[PDB]
């Protein structure tokens, strides 16, 4: 079925007849909406960039991807957040080249 039917190994456990579960609305929490995408784009225009974010952009422009990630981790704290920030600052650069 879905489990191997035995008590050891890969995918161990008792076989049961699966029943499809209606997803909970709480699991939609990370999803984006038209309302928040719109509001965040205008606030970006009004607010602008942070001092460390301008510093990140210069490092990316000067081909310092390795340098920018080390800065973005030092600022944001974690490597996972630093990766997303560097990707976001490259997209900002990609939108300034037209």
């Amino acid at each position: 079925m879905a489990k191997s039917g035995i008590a050891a190994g890969v995918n161990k456990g008792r076989k049961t007849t699966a029943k499809e579960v209606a997803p909970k609305i709480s699991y939609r929490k990370g999803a984006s909406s038209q309302r928040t995408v719109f509001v965040r784009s205008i606030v970006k225009e009004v607010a602008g960039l942070a001092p460390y974010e301008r510093r990140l952009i210069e490092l990316i422009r000067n081909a310092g991807e390795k340098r920018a990630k080390k800065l973005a981790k030092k600022r944001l704290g974690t490597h996972k957040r630093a990766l997303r920030k560097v990707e976001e600052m490259t997209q900002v650069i990609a939108e300034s080249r037209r």
Partner: protein
Amino acid sequence: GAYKYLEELQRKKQSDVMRFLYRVRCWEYRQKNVIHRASRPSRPDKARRLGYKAKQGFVIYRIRVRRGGRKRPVPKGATYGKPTNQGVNQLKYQKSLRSTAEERVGRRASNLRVLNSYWVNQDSTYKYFEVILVDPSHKAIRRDARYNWIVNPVHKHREARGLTSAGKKSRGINKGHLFNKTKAGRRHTWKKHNTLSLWRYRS
């Protein structure tokens, strides 16, 4: 409406606009009394999030609280004990500055109930907080089915007992394995785990 924009803009605290506003307002708040009445929220959206309503009986105080740790107030640094207890500097208060702000504001306006509070601004010497208070004797509060609850006497000085958001944060009142010691009250849990329970028919 505009509250969503207000929310998204206050998260850009390092933008030029917000930095300018923080400079100006920090100077202005520093020029007033340590505790003073705010004619209105400086962050209406943040006040709304925390239960504030633009009604009669809702009050805002701004307060200014000194930053840093808690120096041990022993004379000349002499602790008179074992070397593990000789620290005087690098010691920390177990409550947040937000809680101190709430308690001092609640002490000043002793006829009101501290509803909640929020951070407004900051410098090297002070943090600035705005405290949302509710008047329990005002009929606009007493006849409000959503705010009658704070009129009942179990909410007398809830900020002094750690029952606000900041107080419950500092008490460790959260669910899960990371809060085993403080989930239901640290001292209650300790007393429960250090009580000898003896029954009539001993097992």
